[PDB]
Design an enzyme around this catalytic site. Structure first.
Site, PDB file in Angstrom:
ATOM      1  N   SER A  36       0.197  15.400 -12.319  1.00  0.00           N
ATOM      2  CA  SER A  36       0.106  15.020 -13.715  1.00  0.00           C
ATOM      3  C   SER A  36      -0.088  16.263 -14.572  1.00  0.00           C
ATOM      4  O   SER A  36      -0.703  17.247 -14.156  1.00  0.00           O
ATOM      5  CB  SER A  36      -1.072  14.059 -13.903  1.00  0.00           C
ATOM      6  OG  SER A  36      -1.335  13.782 -15.260  1.00  0.00           O
ATOM      7  N   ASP A  40       0.841  -1.193   0.000  1.00  0.00           N
ATOM      8  CA  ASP A  40       0.000   0.000   0.000  1.00  0.00           C
ATOM      9  C   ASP A  40       0.867   1.229   0.000  1.00  0.00           C
ATOM     10  O   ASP A  40       1.187   1.700   1.078  1.00  0.00           O
ATOM     11  CB  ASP A  40      -0.965  -0.035   1.161  1.00  0.00           C
ATOM     12  CG  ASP A  40      -2.017   1.031   1.017  1.00  0.00           C
ATOM     13  OD1 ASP A  40      -1.966   1.784   0.109  1.00  0.00           O
ATOM     14  OD2 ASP A  40      -2.654   1.290   2.071  1.00  0.00           O
TER      15      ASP A  40
HETATM   16  O1  LIG Z   1      -7.957   4.452   1.597  1.00  0.00           O
HETATM   17  C1  LIG Z   1      -7.540   4.439   0.458  1.00  0.00           C
HETATM   18  N1  LIG Z   1      -7.666   3.358  -0.322  1.00  0.00           N
HETATM   19  C2  LIG Z   1      -8.161   2.101   0.211  1.00  0.00           C
HETATM   20  C3  LIG Z   1      -7.375   1.514   1.366  1.00  0.00           C
HETATM   21  C4  LIG Z   1      -8.029   0.250   1.853  1.00  0.00           C
HETATM   22  C5  LIG Z   1      -6.872  -0.633   2.293  1.00  0.00           C
HETATM   23  C6  LIG Z   1      -5.748  -0.174   1.429  1.00  0.00           C
HETATM   24  O2  LIG Z   1      -6.082   1.121   0.940  1.00  0.00           O
HETATM   25  N2  LIG Z   1      -6.963   5.507  -0.119  1.00  0.00           N
HETATM   26  C7  LIG Z   1      -6.706   6.761   0.580  1.00  0.00           C
HETATM   27  C8  LIG Z   1      -5.680   7.595  -0.140  1.00  0.00           C
HETATM   28  C9  LIG Z   1      -5.911   8.986   0.364  1.00  0.00           C
HETATM   29  C10 LIG Z   1      -7.395   9.095   0.506  1.00  0.00           C
HETATM   30  C11 LIG Z   1      -7.929   7.683   0.671  1.00  0.00           C
END
Ligand SMILES: O=C(NC[C@H]1CCCO1)NC1CCCC1
Ligand SMILES: O=C(NC[C@H]1CCCO1)NC1CCCC1
Length: 330
Positions: free
Chosen positions: A199, A35
């Site tokens: 971007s 992640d």
């Molecule tokens: O939570 C986010 N995505 C999903 C999680 C679930 C487990 C791994 O990632 N992204 C964040 C990035 C900044 C705002 C939301």
């Protein structure tokens, strides 16, 4: 040192990718979600509430001769999809693809939210954002990459995610056979703790490129591509019958459609996301309405270059003193 590990989609939609990680002595191998938008390494464990474990592989610290309870330390995290987990903390030996860190903080879950329980394929998360986001209290802990980076041949890791296929995470080196052309590097802001970059614009299908600055993060842990509502509307307008559905929660499109590609700019370079990468399949089994892979960020507060975008590229996370991101076609 270096490490190299294969990352594998959890399902036929590439809803997420799992990478095997060795924890403890003897090793306990768990399949984690690498992640780049968070900074906690947490695992399902022997401490996780029993009713919240449903098929995951667990870490049992009492069976690891190198595990040590980090006295008084707790953690608690909430994600942008509404999911969450929390628990206590051990230090232990963690290895990825042959790269070993001793004394890594391994956050053992006592509680996980329903979405984690319901996904038997993800045994935890391995955060690769900046350590300023780590949730351990009262002493914040470092990510696996932060702990490894002084030992690495070069202070970098790369993400090479596959479309409906395995890919690779490498640590400490850039595999020059894994991409075509050149890598274009672009500036990163660490002010929010993410791999945040700008971007230079976008194109829809064979249309003209629109030069416009789009600030967002490179997030391997986010499945879809989240962009401003103007951009997303321009994309879906090229798909006959596509519409935003409040009941479903985003843009849907007829499963019979052929989707156009989407191009995003990295400096003067261009990364092309093929149309097929934007198809996330029927909204429910048997439906002829399909869920789109490009969605509005309007309700998140930040644009997210998630897996839909990243899997179209070879991506360098350069953790030099001034971090940068690199993107190449592949
Ligand atoms: O939570 C986010 N995505 C999903 C999680 C679930 C487990 C791994 O990632 N992204 C964040 C990035 C900044 C705002 C939301
Ligand atoms: O991509 C998101 N979650 C990823 C899934 C796969 C496994 C863990 O959860 N969530 C996004 C929702 C809106 C921003 C974050």
């Amino acid at each position: 040192s270096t490490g190299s590990a294969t990352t594998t989609p959890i399902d036929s939609l590439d809803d997420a990718y799992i990478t095997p990680v060795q924890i403890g002595t003897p090793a306990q191998t768990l399949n984690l979600d690498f992640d780049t938008g968070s900074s906690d390494l947490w695992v399902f464990s022997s401490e996780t509430t029993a009713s919240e474990v449903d098929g995951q592989t667990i870490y049992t610290p009492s069976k690891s001769t190198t595990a040590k309870l980090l006295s008084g330390a707790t953690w608690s995290i909430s994600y942008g999809d509404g999911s969450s987990s929390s628990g206590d903390v051990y230090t232990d030996t963690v290895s990825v693809g042959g790269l070993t860190v001793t004394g890594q903080a391994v956050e053992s879950a006592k509680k996980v939210s329903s979405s984690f329980t319901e996904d038997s394929t993800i045994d935890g998360l391995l955060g690769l954002a900046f350590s300023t986001l780590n949730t351990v209290s009262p002493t914040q802990q470092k990510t696996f990459f932060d702990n490894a980076k002084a030992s690495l041949d070069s202070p970098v890791f790369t993400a090479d995610l596959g479309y409906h296929a395995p890919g690779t995470y490498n640590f400490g080196f850039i595999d020059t056979t894994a991409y075509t052309g050149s890598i274009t590097y672009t500036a990163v802001s660490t002010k929010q703790g993410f791999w945040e970059w700008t971007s230079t614009g976008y194109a829809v299908g064979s249309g003209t490129f629109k030069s416009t600055s789009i600030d967002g993060i490179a997030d391997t842990g986010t499945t879809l591509l989240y962009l401003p509502a103007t951009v997303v509307s321009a994309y879906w307008a090229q798909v006959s019958g596509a519409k935003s559905s409040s009941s479903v929660g985003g843009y849907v499109f007829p499963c019979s459609a052929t989707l156009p590609s989407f191009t995003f700019g990295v400096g003067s370079a261009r990364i092309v996301i093929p149309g097929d990468y934007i198809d996330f399949g029927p909204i429910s089994t048997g439906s002829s309405s399909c869920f789109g892979g490009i969605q509005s960020s309007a309700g998140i507060g930040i644009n997210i270059f998630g897996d839909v975008a990243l899997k179209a590229a070879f991506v360098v996370f350069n953790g030099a003193t001034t971090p940068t991101l690199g993107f190449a076609s592949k």
